[PDB]
Write an enzyme that holds these catalytic residues in place. Sequence first.
Site, PDB file in Angstrom:
ATOM      1  N   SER A 145     -67.407  -7.515  11.608  1.00  0.00           N
ATOM      2  CA  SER A 145     -67.728  -6.306  10.711  1.00  0.00           C
ATOM      3  C   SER A 145     -67.024  -6.186  10.339  1.00  0.00           C
ATOM      4  CB  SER A 145     -69.219  -5.513  11.414  1.00  0.00           C
ATOM      5  OG  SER A 145     -69.794  -4.708  10.843  1.00  0.00           O
ATOM      6  N   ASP A 248     -75.635 -12.588   5.118  1.00  0.00           N
ATOM      7  CA  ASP A 248     -75.993 -11.133   6.846  1.00  0.00           C
ATOM      8  C   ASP A 248     -76.369 -10.531   6.249  1.00  0.00           C
ATOM      9  OD1 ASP A 248     -73.212 -10.066   8.913  1.00  0.00           O
ATOM     10  OD2 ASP A 248     -73.667  -8.925   6.805  1.00  0.00           O
ATOM     11  N   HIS A 292     -76.362 -11.113  12.063  1.00  0.00           N
ATOM     12  CA  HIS A 292     -75.076 -10.459  12.396  1.00  0.00           C
ATOM     13  C   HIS A 292     -73.977 -10.607  13.223  1.00  0.00           C
ATOM     14  CE1 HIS A 292     -73.152  -6.980   9.928  1.00  0.00           C
ATOM     15  NE2 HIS A 292     -72.760  -6.199  11.161  1.00  0.00           N
TER      16      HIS A 292
HETATM   17  O1  AY4 Z   1     -66.854  -2.414   6.046  1.00  0.00           O
HETATM   18  C1  AY4 Z   1     -67.368  -2.176   4.505  1.00  0.00           C
HETATM   19  C2  AY4 Z   1     -66.831  -2.888   3.645  1.00  0.00           C
HETATM   20  F1  AY4 Z   1     -65.241  -2.865   3.298  1.00  0.00           F
HETATM   21  C3  AY4 Z   1     -67.458  -2.969   2.272  1.00  0.00           C
HETATM   22  C4  AY4 Z   1     -68.631  -3.696   2.751  1.00  0.00           C
HETATM   23  F2  AY4 Z   1     -69.316  -3.397   1.287  1.00  0.00           F
HETATM   24  C5  AY4 Z   1     -69.682  -3.433   3.592  1.00  0.00           C
HETATM   25  C6  AY4 Z   1     -69.048  -2.847   4.688  1.00  0.00           C
HETATM   26  C7  AY4 Z   1     -69.368  -2.973   5.701  1.00  0.00           C
HETATM   27  C8  AY4 Z   1     -70.776  -3.051   6.305  1.00  0.00           C
HETATM   28  C9  AY4 Z   1     -71.342  -2.633   7.461  1.00  0.00           C
HETATM   29  N1  AY4 Z   1     -69.850  -2.404   8.000  1.00  0.00           N
HETATM   30  N2  AY4 Z   1     -69.609  -2.430   7.023  1.00  0.00           N
END
Ligand code: AY4
EC number: 3.1.1.98
Length: 346
Positions: A145, A248, A292
């Site tokens: 994630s 996702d 996820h």
């Molecule tokens: O870290 C992210 C990112 F860099 C870009 C994005 F669109 C989403 C996330 C995200 C969503 C949940 N954790 N991280």
Amino acid sequence: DLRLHLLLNTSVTCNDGSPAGYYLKESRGSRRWLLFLEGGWYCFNRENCDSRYDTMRRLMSSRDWPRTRTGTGILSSQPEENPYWWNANMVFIPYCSSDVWSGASSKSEKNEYAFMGALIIQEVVRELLGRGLSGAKVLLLAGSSAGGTGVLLNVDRVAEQLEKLGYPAIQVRGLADSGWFLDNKQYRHDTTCAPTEAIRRGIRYWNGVVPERCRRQFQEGEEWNCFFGYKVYPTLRSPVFVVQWLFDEAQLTVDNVHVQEGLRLYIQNLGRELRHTLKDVPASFAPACLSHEIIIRSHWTDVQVKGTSLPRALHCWDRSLHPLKGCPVHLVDSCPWPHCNPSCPT
Ligand SMILES: Oc1c(F)cc(F)cc1-c1cc[nH]n1
Ligand SMILES: *[C@@H]1O[C@H](CO)[C@@H](O)[C@H](O)[C@H]1NC(C)=O
């Protein structure tokens, strides 16, 4: 179990100024090292970081961390659970910086919180060199994630750090799980803030850092682009294996999706777009499931694409870095709806 070590350099801290750290289980007979970056969203201003501090404090502080943690999935030392790398030296790096592992800013008279994600990674690598990492053949930087995006942002910096320290024989590689996001239009459109805008603000709040070649392409004000895998991946030098569910759940959440014709076409288009971004990624595993994360889940061995499991695909990747008969490394589902693959997580 993996044992906690708080960083000896106490200036490298979690959000609240407490020392960061890592959990380690050594394997004396092994020259392979797995460093895993935990995930868990982010925060981007005083108000939303304050709320995270009330109810997600273990993601902002080390004060309440337990002394041990059980290795699961790719961090397991049992071959039944981890057919890929059960004999490796295992490291779990807790996410306590709330900055997608990008920050380089200390708490100070002008900053209520510290955002030190990029510095935490470099300090863990430094301290591990004295505990056996100096003898490594392969260092795999992995994450899930926000930790998967953290791999994309930091893998080449780990490689440069070890080169400049005099260890050119250590092969640095990356494994990014569920951190390959699309800056697409939401299905329907305060912390209403799409990730492109939230990351633009976060970079300033965190003093965030991105890989050099990607920074040189996009330039000042536009470094948010480097947090999106399809844009940053072509700039990287280290080998990176990309694991990504086609549907996702975090991507759907940021897209404001919670079935009629409009939503059906939206979901099908998302899967097709993700597939297109992976077409030229030679090491990848992308099943047609609504889920996820995967790599530290105990049942990570169950899903298959074209009859090949994820631990097998990773072993085939290892062989390719020494095409292989019956040992594929690029595995992307082509069916267009979640759970069209029967092996998806239940
Ligand atoms: O870290 C992210 C990112 F860099 C870009 C994005 F669109 C989403 C996330 C995200 C969503 C949940 N954790 N991280
Ligand atoms: C501690 O970490 C900081 C931040 O990365 C660095 O500037 C400093 O040189 C380090 N000091 C020691 C003794 O490791």
